[PDB]
Amino acid sequence: VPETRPNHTIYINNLNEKIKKDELKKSLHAIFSRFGQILDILVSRSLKMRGQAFVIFKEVSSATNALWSMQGFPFYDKPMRIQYAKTDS
After folding, report:
1. DSSP string of 14-71?
2. Of 23, 57, 62, 77, which has the fewest CB atoms closer than 10 Å, so is most exposed?
């Protein structure tokens, strides 16, 4: 059940786990900067957050535009799964 409450942060799933944090960040920034100001991009070197990223936009509308635009966009040969970050509560 996807998160549907619009949020300035997008949760991205199903990313290619063979890519170095530093390359993935640079490549996410390249495809997401179009939608507006990115505050940060969180990827981890964990087993908890491996095929997973947070793109934190300044504006919710940036996030909504990035979500619709890039839903299923093939990135390192895998369609990205994008939802809104979980709500404040």
Report:
1. S--TTS-HHHHHHHHHHHHGGGS-EEEEE--SSSSSSS-EEEEESSHHHHHHHHHHHT
2. 77
- Way it was determined: X-ray
CA distances from 2 to 6, 10, 11, 65 (A): 11, 12, 10, 17
Could you give all domains of the chain from N- to C-terminal order, each with its CATH number?
9-83 (3.30.70.330)
**Backbone phi and psi for residue 88, each to the nearest 5 degrees, phi listed first:** -55, -55
CA 1 to chain centre: 17
Helix (H, G, I), strand (E, B) or coil at 56: strand
List the resolution, Å.
2.5
